[PDB]
Structure 1
């Protein structure tokens, strides 16, 4: 039923808004777009960093490393947002808690690199709630171990953004990724898929009404997950090698592995 799918969308979008501070609109204004009225601190040098870090304020402060530990803080911060969001997806709370937890522990990575793309352009990604901007070439130029961490995220986002999806389209697409269903260790895989399908239908009507002129956008968007999985896979890989570099107590704890 058209209306049903339409309201499921308004609801989810409404949730996307209260769960996520930096919406993609609010982030395009600030980014490559003019708007904003007053741009963010740009970090392109080892010196702009010290200045931005010392002036742009910061939470994760106690080079190539301090940056990594930077993502981590924001990620661990993201995950909390995504999770409070998942809890609004109709019927998510009603699933087996063991399942719910497995859906997050597994889909939280893709919902990040998905939303990261909203804060990206070919030359860099917004930082600190958009109050900053770290150039892309600065990042790829970091110490040997850390110069490939964010590069493949750029390569993806450049493609993902190709679809020019807005918030309301991403709110649904995101739901669809959480109510995955093929995550290892799931107990009652049925109600999950039962909801995803109810999410997938809403994505369709949504992507059809919001991008009528975009041919087979639904198909194209679904195949981007084949790209997210590869990022998250290739990512967790590097994330292993970093342990053959870093090798704390109460911190190493707060950052299990996100």
Structure 2
């Protein structure tokens, strides 16, 4: 029954709103004047924005990634069936899905010229980020490239809540014990997302299929990021990575 798929879409949107304090809707209202962001565009304004700069920015990003992980974890528990799965598998799903979600959600805070930071209070420009040191100057560019074309789908928060749930419940992650109950949940989530996109974007042909194709882009970004992490580890032996993030990327 489609009525059941609507109730599922509503439950997940409700949980998403409860779990993620900075939504796409809020981000778009900031980026498009009730509270305008301070703009970090150069090495000078970063001072007034308030251990070299590149590393400082990187750790800021690290810090925000761990809060995102906390937030994503909370949302995952709201996905019906998720907490009933084998504990090891829950860990497995989160481990491999978390970065994908982060990048997906990071696009909501981005436009072609930059990205919102510190809960929307700031806006760090694209050029500034790209002119960083050596190994850091190119953490954020592939992010920006994905965001530009993901943001072209014009998904709103209610779409993204279902899509993020589809991502968590894959079933093709490495080392999963009981693949079949995961796939049974993803199958229900896929059904709800399909109905959601048809109702919310009726003019937007094959949006469902176009959204699923975007999972290839997320995979490569994660891959690329992990390589950079390995580069950073060895040329910055005096810099610490956060263990929650360090555990995640095995």
Q: Which runs of 4+ in 1 moved over 4 A?
A: 248-256
Q: Which runs of 5+ in 1 are unaligned?
A: 54-62
1:50 partner SS: helix
Quote the offset at 1:254 in angstroms.
Answer: 12
Would the alpha carbon gap of residues 102 and 47 (structure 1) be closer, same or farther in structure 2, given more than 3 Å must change?
same
Instruction: Determine if contact 1:149/1:235 at 8 Å carries over to the other structure.
Output: yes
Q: Contact 1:76 / 1:255 at 8 angstroms: preserved in 2? A: no
Q: 1: distance between equivalents of 2:229 and 2:182? A: 29
Give 1:253 deviation, angstroms: 9.5
The answer (yes or no) to whether the contact 1:30–1:130 under 8 Å persists in 2 is yes
Distance 1:254 1:13, change over 3 A: closer
Over the aligned positions, Cα root-mean-square deviation in angstroms equals 2.1
Indicate yes or no: 2:24 matched with 1:10: no
Counterpart for residue 247 of structure 2: 253
In 2 relative to 1, CA 249–229 (structure 1 residues): closer, same or farther, beyond 3 Å?
A: closer
Deviation at 1:255, TM superposition (A): 11
The C-alpha deviation readout for 1:23-65, integer Å capped at 9, x for no partner, is: 100110001xxx6423111000111111113xxxxxxxxx000
Q: How far, CA to CA, are the matches of 1:225 and 1:182 in structure 2?
A: 13
The structural deviation recorded for 1:174 is 0.2
Aligned residue-pair number: 244
1:153 corresponding residue in structure 2: 143
Unaligned runs of 5+ in 2: none
The 5 Å alignment of 1:129-168 reads 129-168=119-158
Structure 1 range deviating more: 84-93 or 247-256: 247-256
Q: Which residue of 2 aligns with 1:66?
A: 56
Report the structure, 1 or 2, having the larger helix content: 2
